[PDB]
Design a protein around this ligand. Structure first.
Ligand SMILES: Nc1nc2c(ncn2[C@@H]2CNC[C@@H]2OCP(=O)(O)O)c(=O)[nH]1
Ligand SMILES: Nc1nc2c(ncn2[C@@H]2CNC[C@@H]2OCP(=O)(O)O)c(=O)[nH]1
Ligand SMILES: Nc1nc2c(ncn2[C@@H]2CNC[C@@H]2OCP(=O)(O)O)c(=O)[nH]1
Ligand SMILES: Nc1nc2c(ncn2[C@@H]2CNC[C@@H]2OCP(=O)(O)O)c(=O)[nH]1
Ligand SMILES: [Mg+2]
Ligand SMILES: [Mg+2]
Ligand SMILES: [Mg+2]
Ligand SMILES: [Mg+2]
Ligand SMILES: [Mg+2]
Ligand SMILES: [Mg+2]
Ligand SMILES: [Mg+2]
Ligand SMILES: [Mg+2]
Lengths: 181, 174, 186, 185
């Protein structure tokens, strides 16, 4: 069982993803025309891989994929969000129109740090699209242009999100019964 | 946009088989811990996301990034690992999820590589199978669709990192 | 001896290199002879693989204060690396450099483009201090805008190999630095 | 001097280490002499970061035949690393070793599990040859099943630091190899 409640059903998620796709799509409409390049989705492994595969199919504009793998350092990652790069971008993003695809944004320390990092590669444009936004996503030195859902503070799992590498494969997002934590 | 010459399999055709072998895979794996899907970036991310939701038993994700050496990865297997597995797979029930198997040289090497980590079991599930999965020799337990010898794109598959985001698989016009 | 015919002329002898490194060791040592007390942490040598491995191993032994190693591996992106300096990271630092006194150890600074990007990358991790120590500096480093506190040798614009420096992964194991005969170029 | 009151005793001095490497180099050089002729490629030194970095820089300078460098970076998975030797690859070889004459350069061989795992891994890339040279060998390496062609010193089982070898990332920069005062652990 260990699912205490269903926060967001599969139907609700896929409905808003098609919604975000249209919005993102017309904002970057005319890209493949003016620049000749596609909208580039950058995703940090691995909580947002389910989201990015669905989102890209919802975007009515040519879309490329790019993945990063990162790892925490320890006692200061929780303070500055500086994170270890295990897998960098395969391609350069110079003069590219880049959209960071996130699963959740809470502290936003890491996202803030990633933004500054990707900025140093000098892209043509850069903003963030998150599926879920927690109450305290108001701090984080980073503006989010696209938000899927504004969710409560309690820990959620499903649809890419995990607890000890579990529950990622669920089509819905929900909360765990505290007996598992 | 006038570059796709042929559509091989529509989005509906794809989702059906995935739900099919997904139920098939789920029953075969119905150790005490979850089934582990391993994918090599980037071509099979759309397949592994859809597949995992189709497999009716608990399923975990793990990704590898690899790179070519050139005159030998052409010659045979052995690729450069850019990103290794996050966790050790000893005693795990592992399913290699690939997009397409052609020469199968890279697949042959990874299988031999992943075997050395002592998994409890190791099988392969590919969405597409080209002319010649006969030439190589890793037992592919699951095949979505066996396709002819022409270059395909779509549904995660690319040509110079394009056309990955398309919901269907098709053929390119030169 | 090792590579008959490919080395046109010797630029820096093994003894020349070692003497300068012993000098660099004392100078750096005096500049950081304070860290054990005040900060409590060791001088951290960050080196990008792999032209400067021979240099950093000799240098670390020539520095009379406690010294730690960190290695990075990077890769070129293409014409973008040669324009902005941005490189693909293949191997990052094992540990965060927050509040650490950091000394970048380089083999050669020419255009200095990748060094510039790297230093900006490392600074964003808020080290306590950050400086650069190169073995060789070439004339085009004048237009690089990276400040180098420690320079082993200023040399001409000719292409050199030896002491960690390569051409197609060769000549790194030479105890001395020299120039290549054009028979090797083409 | 460098670490005032941390080193209990000196096991191997700098001069002793350099003297031993010099013979190792010439020995390896004699065995790989007909390389620049027969195959026409250089002896390839492969080192896992980062305990053996000082050793390979000196060794490559002590070997009288052309040698190239290759570096790997690995991480521990956990208890499986300590049982099977299998490690996470953080940094792989830059070039393929197909048809290469490869010498794995190690700092210390104790259990030899990761070394054994590495050997089998590199063997699968079809090298022309593959051997192991380590600076130090401990008594428990006899239980290891990997063959070691070249050994600098056989030492006791005591934990040593210096010359690349560490304790919590310190003492790598020592030119000598010594034993730690338990007032450090
Ligand atoms: N699966 C799951 N993970 C969560 C949740 N909230 C925080 N996290 C994670 C905590 N560390 C990273 C990640 O949040 C991203 P960040 O804004 O940088 O703090 C959650 O509800 N579900
Ligand atoms: N997008 C797309 N790529 C293809 C196709 N056939 C081969 N490929 C690729 C060529 N290099 C690797 C990959 O498959 C060969 P393998 O090593 O056996 O896995 C194809 O129909 N479409
Ligand atoms: N072996 C050897 N390599 C060299 C030489 N000059 C430049 N290089 C290298 C060219 N790519 C990196 C390195 O230049 C450093 P930088 O231009 O500042 O980024 C040289 O004389 N010998
Ligand atoms: N600094 C230092 N490290 C040591 C020592 N003995 C073992 N080690 C290490 C323990 N983990 C890796 C290495 O052992 C090599 P192996 O057991 O063959 O795989 C030692 O005397 N000093
Ligand atoms: Mg995320
Ligand atoms: Mg997680
Ligand atoms: Mg594939
Ligand atoms: Mg492809
Ligand atoms: Mg350099
Ligand atoms: Mg070089
Ligand atoms: Mg070792
Ligand atoms: Mg250590």
């Amino acid at each position: 069982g260990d699912i205490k409640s269903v926060l967001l059903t599969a139907e609700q998620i896929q409905a808003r993803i098609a919604e975000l796709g249209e919005q993102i799509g017309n904002d970057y409409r005319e890209l493949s025309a003016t620049t000749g390049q596609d909208l580039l989705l950058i995703t940090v492994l691995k909580g947002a891989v389910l989201f990015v595969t669905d989102l890209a199919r919802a975007i009515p504009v040519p879309t490329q994929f790019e993945f990063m793998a990162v790892s925490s350092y320890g006692s200061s990652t929780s303070s500055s969000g500086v994170v270890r790069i295990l897998k960098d971008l395969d391609r350069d993003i110079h003069g590219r129109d880049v959209l960071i695809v996130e699963d959740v944004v809470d502290s936003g320390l890491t996202l803030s740090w990633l933004s500054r990092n990707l900025t140093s590669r000098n892209p043509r444009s850069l903003r963030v699209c998150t599926l879920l936004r927690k109450p305290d996503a108001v701090h984080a030195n980073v503006e989010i242009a696209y938000v899927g859902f504004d969710i409560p503070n309690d820990f959620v799992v499903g649809y890419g999100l995990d607890y000890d590498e579990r529950y990622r494969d669920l089509s819905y997002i929900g909360t765990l019964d505290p007996r598992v934590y």
